[PDB]
Amino acid sequence: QTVLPFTGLNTPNGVAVDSAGTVYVTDKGNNRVVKLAAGSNTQTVLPFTGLNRPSGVAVDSAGTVWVTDHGNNRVVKLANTQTVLPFTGLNTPNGVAVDSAGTVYVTDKGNNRVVKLAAGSNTQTVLPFTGLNRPSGVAVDSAGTVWVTDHGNNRVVKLAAGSNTQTVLPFTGLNTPNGVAVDSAGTVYVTDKGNNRVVKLASNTQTVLPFTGLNRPSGVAVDSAGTVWVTDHGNNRVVKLAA
């Protein structure tokens, strides 16, 4: 593993990576989002304003950055105009994901639900998950399958594309799973926050990734080359492992 050269992070939560290898991190305790260009030593604070304990971050292929502004019950995006997305009724939203169509998915953690907003729409859809308990991370693959970490229930669930009912993924021994990412090949990675580890599922037999010294890992992201980035929330750092 290598430790990325961020400085002064305070409980980093979410992480996202784009196709040029730029890494974006929500610096939750400093109310800011920072980024590192590939191979750079200086981080840049993005011109978001008014953030309060931001949690999740996602980036689309057009370089637009979406952040769940947890403490303000809202989702904001940056194209340098910041705009607030027209979600309604959110309660401490935390995970965010965006598909190729520009559809934004949010885990509405305080309301035990997952909602989505189609691009340029004033229509919020509640996804038909059931029995969720503080859902925390969300990922969506190219086929439209949605994965959610059901933090409070120590499980990961998914709604297969076109399905009306969720399935529980065959992970074993999770303790408050927090972040989820899915690569091009359908491999799912989950930060098992309460066990200080990152696991993955290609299969019903999971693997533990060979990170060392994690302390409540939170966010996870994977790039097109299979490199895995994890916010090591308890150690105020971001670490990565190449494939």
d(Cα 227, Cα 224) in Å, to the nearest integer? 8
The secondary structure of residue 8, as a DSSP letter, is S
d(Cα 12, Cα 57) in Å, to the nearest integer? 11
Q: How was this structure determined?
A: X-ray
Give the resolution value in Å.
1.7
d(Cα 92, Cα 129) in Å, to the nearest integer? 18
Q: What angle do CA 121, 136, 25 make, to 5 degrees?
A: 80
Q: Taking the CA of residue 35 as centre, how many other CA atoms within 13 Å lie in the half-sphere pointing to its CB?
A: 20
Q: Report the first-to-last Cα separation within the chain, whole angstroms.
A: 11
Q: What domains are defined for the chain?
A: 2-237 (2.120.10.30)
Element housing 240 (H / E)? strand 237-241
d(Cα 67, Cα 24) in Å, to the nearest integer? 10
- Sequence-separated (6 or more) residues with CB below 8 Å from residue 67: 14, 26, 33, 48, 51, 54, 55, 56, 57, 75, 76, 77, 78, 96
Phi, psi values for residue 76, rounded to 5°: -120, 155
